[PDB]
Design an enzyme around this catalytic site. Structure first.
Site, PDB file in Angstrom:
ATOM      1  N   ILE B  90      -0.939   7.519 -16.523  1.00  0.00           N
ATOM      2  CA  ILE B  90       0.454   7.892 -16.585  1.00  0.00           C
ATOM      3  C   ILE B  90       1.111   7.280 -17.810  1.00  0.00           C
ATOM      4  O   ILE B  90       0.854   6.126 -18.152  1.00  0.00           O
ATOM      5  CB  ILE B  90       1.173   7.408 -15.310  1.00  0.00           C
ATOM      6  N   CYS B  91       1.947   8.075 -18.467  1.00  0.00           N
ATOM      7  CA  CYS B  91       2.814   7.592 -19.519  1.00  0.00           C
ATOM      8  C   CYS B  91       4.256   7.498 -18.992  1.00  0.00           C
ATOM      9  O   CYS B  91       5.019   8.469 -19.030  1.00  0.00           O
ATOM     10  CB  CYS B  91       2.729   8.515 -20.730  1.00  0.00           C
TER      11      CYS B  91
END
Lengths: 92, 160
Positions: B90-91
């Site tokens: 995840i960013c």
């Protein structure tokens, strides 16, 4: 670090009762936890469905039964507490 | 003794207790083990955007040095998304360690903050600028219509 007076044979429910009904405390939906052997044990948390359902049977258990020793600190939190408040357990 | 409540746990009792009452409507939370408060799963079911109707599962684990360090979060639902990879990393800037971009993690951030962040990855924090999955952004760039179809196909296969 506040104090609570209960006997070893008192059910966990009675603690929840004091927390809910005390004229000074009046917790709405409290969480009750304690550390045993390094790891956290959730005694009863009525605020999270998946935990409340899985920990509900602990309510009939005595403090002794749950593995609580005299003088032990319980980590309790509620909507009405800004942060976690510790409670010192006095075995009468 | 070995019966003294940690820094992480003292925080988590409070944070977990308040978590369900403050979820986005689109979110739900599950604790596979009620003692392990440092461990839960989150389901996001978006009500708008490209991922409307998909169900997206996330596993989050909060490290022993919690609130000085952000929770580790992995996504478990295979997805075609610029900020969430196919293998589930995840960013989310709120999950970084704030350097110049003071938008990283801070002790003032709680579990409630994280959930609202993940939830936004499908709405306001869905961005194709500086993505983590460059291929997906490229895809969206070249053919938006086919991009949506890949997204829809993935939702239909892995997120239904």
């Amino acid at each position: 670090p506040q104090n609570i007076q209960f006997s070893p044979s008192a059910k966990l429910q009675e603690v929840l009762d004091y927390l809910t009904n005390s004229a000074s405390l009046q917790m709405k939906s409290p969480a009750i936890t304690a550390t045993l052997e390094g790891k956290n044990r959730t005694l009863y948390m009525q605020s999270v469905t998946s935990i409340e359902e899985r920990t509900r049977p602990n309510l009939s258990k005595t403090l002794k039964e749950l593995g609580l020793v005299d003088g032990q600190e319980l980590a309790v939190a509620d909507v009405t507490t800004p942060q976690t408040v510790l409670f010192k357990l006095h075995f009468t | 003794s070995t019966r003294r409540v940690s820094v992480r746990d003292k925080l988590l009792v409070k944070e977990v207790a308040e978590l369900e009452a403050n979820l986005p409507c689109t979110c739900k939370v599950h604790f596979p083990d009620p003692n392990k408060l440092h461990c839960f799963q989150l389901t996001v079911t978006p009500d708008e955007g490209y991922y409307q109707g998909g169900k997206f599962q996330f596993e989050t684990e909060v490290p022993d040095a919690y609130n000085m360090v952000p929770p580790k979060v992995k996504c478990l639902t295979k997805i075609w998304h610029p900020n969430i990879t196919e293998t589930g990393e995840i960013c989310l800037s709120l999950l970084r360690e704030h350097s110049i971009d003071g938008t990283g993690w801070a002790p003032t951030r709680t579990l409630k903050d994280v959930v609202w962040g993940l939830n936004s990855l499908f709405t306001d924090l869905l961005n194709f600028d500086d993505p983590l999955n460059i291929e997906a952004a490229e895809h969206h760039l070249r053919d938006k219509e086919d991009f949506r179809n890949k997204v829809d196909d993935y939702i239909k296969r892995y997120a239904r």
